PDB file of C-alpha atoms in Angstrom:
ATOM      1  CA  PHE A   1     142.967  73.649  54.506  1.00 45.83           C
ATOM      2  CA  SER A   2     145.572  72.432  56.976  1.00 44.18           C
ATOM      3  CA  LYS A   3     144.997  69.912  59.747  1.00 43.47           C
ATOM      4  CA  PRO A   4     142.709  71.114  62.577  1.00 43.35           C
ATOM      5  CA  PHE A   5     144.694  72.576  65.461  1.00 42.36           C
ATOM      6  CA  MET A   6     141.823  73.239  67.894  1.00 41.68           C
ATOM      7  CA  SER A   7     138.812  70.948  68.229  1.00 40.25           C
ATOM      8  CA  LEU A   8     135.506  72.342  69.458  1.00 37.06           C
ATOM      9  CA  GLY A   9     131.798  71.651  69.561  1.00 38.99           C
ATOM     10  CA  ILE A  10     128.405  72.825  70.753  1.00 37.24           C
ATOM     11  CA  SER A  11     128.117  73.345  74.513  1.00 37.01           C
ATOM     12  CA  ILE A  12     125.529  74.559  77.021  1.00 38.29           C
ATOM     13  CA  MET A  13     125.662  77.938  78.777  1.00 37.97           C
ATOM     14  CA  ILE A  14     123.783  78.315  82.070  1.00 36.76           C
ATOM     15  CA  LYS A  15     123.432  81.028  84.703  1.00 35.64           C
ATOM     16  CA  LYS A  16     125.957  79.204  87.000  1.00 33.47           C
ATOM     17  CA  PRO A  17     123.980  79.130  90.285  1.00 34.26           C
ATOM     18  CA  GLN A  18     125.957  79.776  93.462  1.00 34.86           C
ATOM     19  CA  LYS A  19     125.290  78.892  97.113  1.00 34.88           C
ATOM     20  CA  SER A  20     122.935  81.824  97.688  1.00 37.72           C
ATOM     21  CA  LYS A  21     121.602  80.650 101.042  1.00 37.30           C
ATOM     22  CA  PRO A  22     120.320  83.278 103.509  1.00 35.75           C
ATOM     23  CA  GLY A  23     120.790  83.080 107.257  1.00 32.76           C
ATOM     24  CA  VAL A  24     118.139  83.684 109.924  1.00 32.31           C
ATOM     25  CA  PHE A  25     115.529  83.824 107.128  1.00 35.01           C
ATOM     26  CA  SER A  26     116.378  80.191 106.294  1.00 36.41           C
ATOM     27  CA  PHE A  27     115.394  79.052 109.806  1.00 34.51           C
ATOM     28  CA  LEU A  28     111.709  80.026 109.672  1.00 33.95           C
ATOM     29  CA  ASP A  29     111.374  78.592 106.143  1.00 31.59           C
ATOM     30  CA  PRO A  30     109.667  75.185 106.424  1.00 34.79           C
ATOM     31  CA  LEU A  31     106.347  75.892 108.134  1.00 31.68           C
ATOM     32  CA  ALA A  32     105.528  79.613 107.682  1.00 31.74           C
ATOM     33  CA  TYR A  33     106.251  83.099 108.963  1.00 31.15           C
ATOM     34  CA  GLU A  34     102.643  83.537 110.160  1.00 34.54           C
ATOM     35  CA  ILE A  35     101.558  80.247 111.773  1.00 35.36           C
ATOM     36  CA  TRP A  36     104.193  80.775 114.495  1.00 37.42           C
ATOM     37  CA  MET A  37     102.404  83.922 115.694  1.00 36.75           C
ATOM     38  CA  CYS A  38      99.183  81.933 116.134  1.00 38.46           C
ATOM     39  CA  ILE A  39     101.235  79.283 117.960  1.00 37.98           C
ATOM     40  CA  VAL A  40     102.591  81.889 120.407  1.00 37.59           C
ATOM     41  CA  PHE A  41      99.077  83.342 120.788  1.00 37.66           C
ATOM     42  CA  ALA A  42      97.638  79.919 121.613  1.00 37.64           C
ATOM     43  CA  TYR A  43     100.592  79.441 123.991  1.00 35.29           C
ATOM     44  CA  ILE A  44      99.815  82.583 125.976  1.00 33.12           C
ATOM     45  CA  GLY A  45      96.092  81.773 125.785  1.00 35.02           C
ATOM     46  CA  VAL A  46      96.586  78.313 127.281  1.00 35.89           C
ATOM     47  CA  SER A  47      98.774  79.921 129.960  1.00 35.30           C
ATOM     48  CA  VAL A  48      95.865  82.294 130.686  1.00 33.13           C
ATOM     49  CA  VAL A  49      93.610  79.209 130.911  1.00 35.09           C
ATOM     50  CA  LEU A  50      95.990  77.528 133.377  1.00 36.91           C
ATOM     51  CA  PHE A  51      96.375  80.651 135.536  1.00 38.75           C
TER      52      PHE A  51
ATOM     53  CA  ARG B   1      93.337  99.036 144.717  1.00 38.50           C
ATOM     54  CA  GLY B   2      91.686 101.507 142.355  1.00 35.95           C
ATOM     55  CA  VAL B   3      94.823 101.873 140.224  1.00 38.04           C
ATOM     56  CA  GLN B   4      94.729  98.249 139.046  1.00 36.63           C
ATOM     57  CA  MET B   5      90.973  98.473 138.415  1.00 39.14           C
ATOM     58  CA  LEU B   6      91.401 101.662 136.369  1.00 39.91           C
ATOM     59  CA  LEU B   7      94.277 100.082 134.425  1.00 38.55           C
ATOM     60  CA  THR B   8      92.113  97.019 133.721  1.00 43.40           C
ATOM     61  CA  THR B   9      89.253  99.286 132.610  1.00 44.26           C
ATOM     62  CA  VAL B  10      91.398 101.334 130.222  1.00 43.92           C
ATOM     63  CA  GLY B  11      92.975  98.124 128.915  1.00 47.23           C
ATOM     64  CA  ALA B  12      89.525  96.705 128.172  1.00 48.97           C
ATOM     65  CA  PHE B  13      88.544 100.008 126.534  1.00 49.35           C
ATOM     66  CA  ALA B  14      91.686 100.046 124.367  1.00 48.67           C
ATOM     67  CA  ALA B  15      91.118  96.389 123.450  1.00 49.70           C
ATOM     68  CA  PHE B  16      87.524  97.164 122.444  1.00 48.06           C
ATOM     69  CA  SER B  17      88.690 100.164 120.391  1.00 46.54           C
ATOM     70  CA  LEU B  18      91.361  98.132 118.588  1.00 46.86           C
ATOM     71  CA  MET B  19      88.800  95.369 117.987  1.00 45.40           C
ATOM     72  CA  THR B  20      86.470  97.971 116.454  1.00 46.42           C
ATOM     73  CA  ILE B  21      89.356  99.222 114.296  1.00 46.96           C
ATOM     74  CA  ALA B  22      90.042  95.626 113.222  1.00 46.57           C
ATOM     75  CA  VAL B  23      86.366  95.263 112.284  1.00 45.26           C
ATOM     76  CA  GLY B  24      86.490  98.558 110.353  1.00 49.62           C
ATOM     77  CA  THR B  25      89.117  98.431 107.592  1.00 50.14           C
ATOM     78  CA  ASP B  26      92.713  97.610 106.573  1.00 51.79           C
ATOM     79  CA  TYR B  27      92.647  94.092 108.023  1.00 49.72           C
ATOM     80  CA  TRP B  28      94.648  92.421 105.242  1.00 53.78           C
ATOM     81  CA  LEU B  29      96.546  93.268 102.063  1.00 53.45           C
ATOM     82  CA  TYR B  30      96.391  91.363  98.780  1.00 54.57           C
ATOM     83  CA  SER B  31      97.827  92.316  95.397  1.00 55.54           C
ATOM     84  CA  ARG B  32      95.045  92.103  92.812  1.00 57.78           C
ATOM     85  CA  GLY B  33      95.404  92.176  89.025  1.00 60.03           C
ATOM     86  CA  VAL B  34      98.085  96.242  91.884  1.00 59.17           C
ATOM     87  CA  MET B  35      97.802  96.103  95.669  1.00 59.89           C
ATOM     88  CA  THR B  36      94.442  96.106  97.444  1.00 57.15           C
ATOM     89  CA  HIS B  37      93.413  96.259 101.102  1.00 59.04           C
ATOM     90  CA  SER B  38      90.466  94.535 102.757  1.00 57.32           C
ATOM     91  CA  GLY B  39      88.655  94.788 106.073  1.00 60.41           C
ATOM     92  CA  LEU B  40      86.693  91.482 105.954  1.00 60.57           C
ATOM     93  CA  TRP B  41      83.648  93.242 104.408  1.00 60.75           C
ATOM     94  CA  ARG B  42      84.814  95.082 101.273  1.00 60.07           C
ATOM     95  CA  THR B  43      88.017  95.403  99.250  1.00 61.20           C
ATOM     96  CA  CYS B  44      89.573  98.703  98.153  1.00 62.74           C
ATOM     97  CA  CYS B  45      92.347  99.062  95.588  1.00 62.61           C
ATOM     98  CA  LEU B  46      95.461 101.138  96.234  1.00 59.44           C
ATOM     99  CA  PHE B  47      89.764 102.543  88.667  1.00 60.46           C
ATOM    100  CA  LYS B  48      91.844 103.619  91.666  1.00 62.85           C
ATOM    101  CA  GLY B  49      89.627 104.674  94.572  1.00 63.08           C
ATOM    102  CA  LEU B  50      86.634 102.413  93.929  1.00 64.97           C
ATOM    103  CA  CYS B  51      85.432 100.030  96.634  1.00 62.93           C
ATOM    104  CA  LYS B  52      83.082  97.049  96.529  1.00 62.29           C
ATOM    105  CA  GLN B  53      82.025  94.189  98.796  1.00 60.86           C
ATOM    106  CA  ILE B  54      84.389  91.428  97.679  1.00 64.40           C
ATOM    107  CA  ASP B  55      83.319  88.998 100.444  1.00 65.01           C
ATOM    108  CA  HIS B  56      81.624  86.597  98.039  1.00 62.27           C
ATOM    109  CA  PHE B  57      81.162  83.205  99.700  1.00 63.05           C
ATOM    110  CA  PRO B  58      80.916  81.217  96.403  1.00 62.14           C
ATOM    111  CA  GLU B  59      83.428  81.592  93.586  1.00 61.01           C
ATOM    112  CA  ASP B  60      83.130  67.608 101.333  1.00 60.24           C
ATOM    113  CA  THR B  61      80.779  69.478 103.667  1.00 58.86           C
ATOM    114  CA  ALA B  62      83.687  70.726 105.804  1.00 55.92           C
ATOM    115  CA  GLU B  63      84.768  73.084 103.010  1.00 55.41           C
ATOM    116  CA  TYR B  64      81.236  74.511 102.819  1.00 55.38           C
ATOM    117  CA  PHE B  65      81.181  74.866 106.615  1.00 52.94           C
ATOM    118  CA  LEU B  66      84.543  76.674 106.613  1.00 53.61           C
ATOM    119  CA  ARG B  67      83.350  78.951 103.795  1.00 54.07           C
ATOM    120  CA  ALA B  68      80.150  79.668 105.750  1.00 52.45           C
ATOM    121  CA  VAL B  69      82.178  80.567 108.852  1.00 55.21           C
ATOM    122  CA  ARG B  70      84.543  82.759 106.808  1.00 55.72           C
ATOM    123  CA  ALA B  71      81.538  84.478 105.225  1.00 58.61           C
ATOM    124  CA  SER B  72      80.069  87.474 107.115  1.00 61.57           C
ATOM    125  CA  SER B  73      82.598  87.098 110.006  1.00 61.17           C
ATOM    126  CA  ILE B  74      80.595  84.904 112.375  1.00 64.33           C
ATOM    127  CA  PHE B  75      83.414  84.433 114.896  1.00 65.07           C
ATOM    128  CA  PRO B  76      84.927  87.950 115.372  1.00 66.33           C
ATOM    129  CA  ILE B  77      81.618  89.858 115.413  1.00 64.43           C
ATOM    130  CA  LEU B  78      80.254  87.606 118.170  1.00 69.79           C
ATOM    131  CA  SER B  79      83.665  87.896 119.851  1.00 71.47           C
ATOM    132  CA  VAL B  80      83.380  91.703 119.817  1.00 70.53           C
ATOM    133  CA  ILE B  81      79.806  91.479 121.140  1.00 71.08           C
ATOM    134  CA  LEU B  82      81.062  89.253 123.971  1.00 71.83           C
ATOM    135  CA  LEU B  83      83.881  91.747 124.641  1.00 73.07           C
ATOM    136  CA  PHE B  84      81.333  94.575 124.852  1.00 71.02           C
ATOM    137  CA  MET B  85      79.209  92.445 127.194  1.00 68.11           C
ATOM    138  CA  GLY B  86      82.260  91.772 129.359  1.00 64.57           C
ATOM    139  CA  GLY B  87      83.049  95.481 129.426  1.00 64.70           C
ATOM    140  CA  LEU B  88      79.470  96.243 130.460  1.00 64.95           C
ATOM    141  CA  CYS B  89      79.717  93.569 133.170  1.00 62.74           C
ATOM    142  CA  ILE B  90      83.002  95.058 134.417  1.00 58.51           C
ATOM    143  CA  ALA B  91      81.386  98.508 134.465  1.00 56.79           C
ATOM    144  CA  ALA B  92      78.418  97.125 136.415  1.00 56.75           C
ATOM    145  CA  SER B  93      80.817  95.386 138.820  1.00 58.34           C
ATOM    146  CA  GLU B  94      83.003  98.479 139.277  1.00 54.85           C
ATOM    147  CA  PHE B  95      80.229 100.494 140.958  1.00 50.04           C
ATOM    148  CA  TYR B  96      77.958  99.080 143.707  1.00 48.98           C
ATOM    149  CA  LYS B  97      79.734  95.742 144.170  1.00 46.19           C
ATOM    150  CA  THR B  98      76.872  93.853 145.799  1.00 46.64           C
ATOM    151  CA  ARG B  99      77.558  90.276 144.663  1.00 46.24           C
ATOM    152  CA  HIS B 100      81.214  89.220 144.932  1.00 48.10           C
ATOM    153  CA  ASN B 101      80.908  86.413 142.358  1.00 48.05           C
ATOM    154  CA  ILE B 102      79.821  88.147 139.132  1.00 44.86           C
ATOM    155  CA  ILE B 103      83.421  89.236 138.477  1.00 45.09           C
ATOM    156  CA  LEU B 104      84.425  85.578 138.039  1.00 45.46           C
ATOM    157  CA  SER B 105      81.710  84.996 135.429  1.00 45.38           C
ATOM    158  CA  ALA B 106      82.649  88.277 133.728  1.00 45.98           C
ATOM    159  CA  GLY B 107      86.302  87.225 133.599  1.00 47.06           C
ATOM    160  CA  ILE B 108      85.349  83.776 132.302  1.00 49.45           C
ATOM    161  CA  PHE B 109      83.255  85.409 129.563  1.00 50.73           C
ATOM    162  CA  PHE B 110      86.168  87.757 128.815  1.00 46.23           C
ATOM    163  CA  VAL B 111      88.657  84.878 128.471  1.00 45.08           C
ATOM    164  CA  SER B 112      86.169  82.968 126.295  1.00 44.01           C
ATOM    165  CA  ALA B 113      85.738  86.082 124.130  1.00 41.88           C
ATOM    166  CA  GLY B 114      89.515  86.315 123.752  1.00 42.95           C
ATOM    167  CA  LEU B 115      89.725  82.627 122.826  1.00 43.49           C
ATOM    168  CA  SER B 116      86.923  83.065 120.281  1.00 42.14           C
ATOM    169  CA  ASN B 117      88.699  86.107 118.818  1.00 43.70           C
ATOM    170  CA  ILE B 118      91.905  84.069 118.507  1.00 42.80           C
ATOM    171  CA  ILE B 119      89.913  81.259 116.870  1.00 44.18           C
ATOM    172  CA  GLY B 120      88.395  83.762 114.442  1.00 44.08           C
ATOM    173  CA  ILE B 121      91.866  85.100 113.659  1.00 45.99           C
ATOM    174  CA  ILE B 122      92.905  81.508 112.919  1.00 46.81           C
ATOM    175  CA  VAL B 123      89.853  81.106 110.654  1.00 47.69           C
ATOM    176  CA  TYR B 124      90.610  84.336 108.774  1.00 47.70           C
ATOM    177  CA  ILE B 125      94.246  83.284 108.379  1.00 49.07           C
ATOM    178  CA  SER B 126      93.148  79.856 107.109  1.00 51.22           C
ATOM    179  CA  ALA B 127      90.637  81.297 104.626  1.00 50.93           C
ATOM    180  CA  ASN B 128      93.271  83.578 103.060  1.00 50.29           C
ATOM    181  CA  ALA B 129      94.354  80.805 100.676  1.00 51.11           C
ATOM    182  CA  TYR B 130     101.235  89.182  99.294  1.00 47.59           C
ATOM    183  CA  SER B 131     101.400  91.039 102.618  1.00 47.62           C
ATOM    184  CA  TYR B 132      99.304  91.856 105.696  1.00 47.16           C
ATOM    185  CA  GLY B 133      97.308  94.835 106.913  1.00 43.66           C
ATOM    186  CA  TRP B 134      97.799  96.872 110.058  1.00 42.52           C
ATOM    187  CA  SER B 135      94.425  96.040 111.622  1.00 39.80           C
ATOM    188  CA  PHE B 136      95.477  92.380 111.853  1.00 38.87           C
ATOM    189  CA  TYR B 137      98.436  93.443 114.006  1.00 39.44           C
ATOM    190  CA  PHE B 138      96.088  95.748 115.933  1.00 42.16           C
ATOM    191  CA  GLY B 139      93.718  92.845 116.592  1.00 42.53           C
ATOM    192  CA  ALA B 140      96.659  90.709 117.709  1.00 42.48           C
ATOM    193  CA  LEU B 141      97.789  93.486 120.067  1.00 42.38           C
ATOM    194  CA  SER B 142      94.219  93.778 121.371  1.00 45.81           C
ATOM    195  CA  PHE B 143      94.276  90.022 122.001  1.00 41.99           C
ATOM    196  CA  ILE B 144      97.504  90.506 123.982  1.00 44.76           C
ATOM    197  CA  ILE B 145      95.961  93.361 126.003  1.00 46.68           C
ATOM    198  CA  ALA B 146      92.829  91.239 126.528  1.00 46.05           C
ATOM    199  CA  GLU B 147      94.901  88.325 127.855  1.00 48.89           C
ATOM    200  CA  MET B 148      96.796  90.644 130.216  1.00 45.85           C
ATOM    201  CA  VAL B 149      93.538  92.292 131.317  1.00 46.92           C
ATOM    202  CA  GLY B 150      92.001  88.891 132.011  1.00 47.34           C
ATOM    203  CA  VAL B 151      95.046  87.945 134.096  1.00 44.68           C
ATOM    204  CA  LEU B 152      94.773  91.242 136.007  1.00 43.60           C
ATOM    205  CA  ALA B 153      91.017  90.763 136.510  1.00 45.91           C
ATOM    206  CA  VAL B 154      91.345  87.234 137.879  1.00 46.55           C
ATOM    207  CA  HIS B 155      94.277  88.390 140.042  1.00 47.58           C
ATOM    208  CA  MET B 156      92.118  91.133 141.567  1.00 47.90           C
ATOM    209  CA  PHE B 157      89.294  88.603 141.969  1.00 46.16           C
ATOM    210  CA  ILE B 158      91.446  86.091 143.852  1.00 46.18           C
ATOM    211  CA  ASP B 159      92.858  88.934 145.969  1.00 45.37           C
ATOM    212  CA  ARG B 160      89.314  90.057 146.833  1.00 46.09           C
ATOM    213  CA  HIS B 161      88.336  86.448 147.594  1.00 45.24           C
ATOM    214  CA  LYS B 162      91.374  86.034 149.861  1.00 47.92           C
ATOM    215  CA  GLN B 163      90.521  89.331 151.583  1.00 50.03           C
ATOM    216  CA  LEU B 164      86.933  88.156 152.124  1.00 51.06           C
ATOM    217  CA  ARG B 165      88.191  84.811 153.457  1.00 53.96           C
ATOM    218  CA  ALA B 166      90.571  86.605 155.833  1.00 53.29           C
ATOM    219  CA  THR B 167      87.786  88.946 156.984  1.00 50.97           C
ATOM    220  CA  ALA B 168      85.359  86.042 157.465  1.00 50.69           C
ATOM    221  CA  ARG B 169      87.549  84.558 160.214  1.00 49.86           C
TER     222      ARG B 169
END
């Protein structure tokens, strides 16, 4: 054999994750998409109580 | 005059009908081991076609109390009974209006029935721990119509009280 011209080794292949961040859907992430409806319902109910 | 009373009456009737439809079936949706609908009494799969009462209450004391409330639908059934009682009171107050103060108690009972129905919706949403049924949205819309009908009823009551106060002088 001659001298090695190209050195190499064992590496790791991943799925290469990108910045796949949605838009308006990212806003209502942290609490729920269903507790907010009960919040608005209690809002209009308390307004009914005040009126 | 009669137009607002008739609109309030048909709003209460539509709210009672949507509350009955929310009691009936298709309240929620939950994917079993395939999708399956539920109406707070029995679950029905989307083999296919069979239905059974899947409202089993067993598998601190606050967890047992919340499970007891979520069992057998203590809040929304009494809420619907109070809505029917408020509708009967509004029907008794529509014809032969002798006492001009029963409409206030009927509206207070109607607002309390709406608040109890909202509390029962909160209990059923809390006990759910993937989609939702159409009768849940129908019950929410009936809660909206009930709130608007309560506002219209107390508006007509304060208008009648102001008319009686203007006629008393």
